[PDB]
Amino acid sequence: QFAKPEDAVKYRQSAGTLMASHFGRMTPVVKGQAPYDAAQIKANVEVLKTLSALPWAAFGPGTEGGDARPEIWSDAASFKQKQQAFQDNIVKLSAAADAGDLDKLRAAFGDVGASCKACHDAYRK
Amino acid sequence: QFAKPEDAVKYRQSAGTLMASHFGRMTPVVKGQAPYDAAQIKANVEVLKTLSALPWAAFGPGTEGGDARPEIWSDAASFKQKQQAFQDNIVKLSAAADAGDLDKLRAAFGDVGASCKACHDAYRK
Ligand code: HEC
Ligand code: HEC
C-alpha cells in the first residue's frame, strides 16, 4: 500500500509511536501508582492488540530506510520469529486483561516489554 | 496518557498517518483498478474502525499544538459533532464491507472521505 519506501517507513514509525503510547500508558497501573479498572485495561489492550499486528507488513519489498537495520530483510526468518513471538506475548497480555487479573497483567506486561526491547536491540539502529 | 502536550500532538498525527494509509489504500479497489476481495476489505475496514476512534482523545486539556486550529477547543461541541459524524460514516463503511457489497462500499467510502475533508477544512491549519 506504499507508493515509495519512505511511505512504508512513515507508516511503521507511526505504528511504533502508537504502540508505545498504548503500552506505556499502563506502566503506572502495573506499578500500582494508578488505579486498576479491569474494563479500562481490557479495552486498552484490545487497541494494543490491533496495533501490534500492523508494523510487520510495512517492512516489505524495497522498503529499506529509517532506523530499520538491514539485518531485518536478509534474515527474514529470524525477524519473523521475533514479531510472531512479540505477538504471542500480546496474546498473553490480552488473556490477562480479558480475565481481569492484575497479577497476571503485571507478568504479561513485563514479557511484552522484554519482547519489544529484544527486537529493537537486534534490529533497530 | 501524555506527559507533555507535544506527546499528544505526536500521537494524533501518527493516528492520522495510519488512518490515511488504511483509508487511501482502498482507493484503487473502489475505483476498480485493483480487484475486490471482500474478506481483505472487511479486515482492513476493521483496522480502520479501530484507528478511527483514536485521534479524538488526544485533543484533551492543554494539548494545543501541531496543525490543530485553536477553534478545536473553544467550540468543543462543534468539533465533537464532526468526529462523531465521521465515526458514523465509519460505521456505515464497516456495514458495507461486512456485507461484502462493493456498490455500497464505494458510496460509503466517498462519505468517509468527505467527512475527513470537512473536518480538516474547518480545524486543521
Ligand atoms: C521487531 C519484531 C520489533 C518489535 C517486537 C517491536 N518493535 Fe518497535 N521498532 C522496530 C523497528 C525495526 C523499528 C524501526 C523502524 C524504522 O524504520 O525506523 C521500530 C521502531 C519503534 C519506535 C520508534 C518510531 C519512531 O519514532 O521512529 C517505537 C516508539 C517503537 N518501535 C515501539 C515499540 C514498542 C512499544 C513495542 C512493543 C510493544 C515495539 N516497538 C515492538 C521493531 C520492533
Ligand atoms: C476532525 C473531526 C477530523 C476528522 C474527521 C479527521 N481528521 Fe485528520 N486531522 C485532524 C486534525 C485537527 C489534524 C491536525 C492534528 C495536529 O495536531 O497536527 C489532523 C491531521 C491529519 C493528518 C496529518 C498528520 C501529520 O502528518 O501531521 C492526516 C494524514 C490525517 N489527519 C488524516 C485523516 C484521514 C485519512 C481522515 C478520515 C479517514 C481524517 N484525518 C479525519 C482532524 C480530523
Curated annotation (Swiss-Prot), chains A, B:
GO-annotated cellular components: periplasmic space
Post-translational modification remark: Binds 1 heme c group covalently per subunit.
Binding site for heme c: R12, Q13, D67, C116, C119, H120
The keyword Transmembrane is annotated on this UniProt entry: no
Residues that bear Pyrrolidone carboxylic acid: Q1
GO biological process, one term: electron transport chain
InterPro entries the UniProt entry points to: Cyt_c/b562, Cyt_c_II, Cyt_c_prime, Cyt_c_prime_subgr
Main location (coarse class): periplasm
One term of GO molecular function: iron ion binding
Localization: Periplasm
Gene3D superfamilies: Cytochrome c/b562
Keywords: Electron transport, Heme, Iron, Metal-binding, Periplasm, Pyrrolidone carboxylic acid, Transport
Quaternary state and interactors: Homodimer.
Function: Cytochrome c' is the most widely occurring bacterial c-type cytochrome. Cytochromes c' are high-spin proteins and the heme has no sixth ligand. Their exact function is not known.
This protein's name: Cytochrome c'
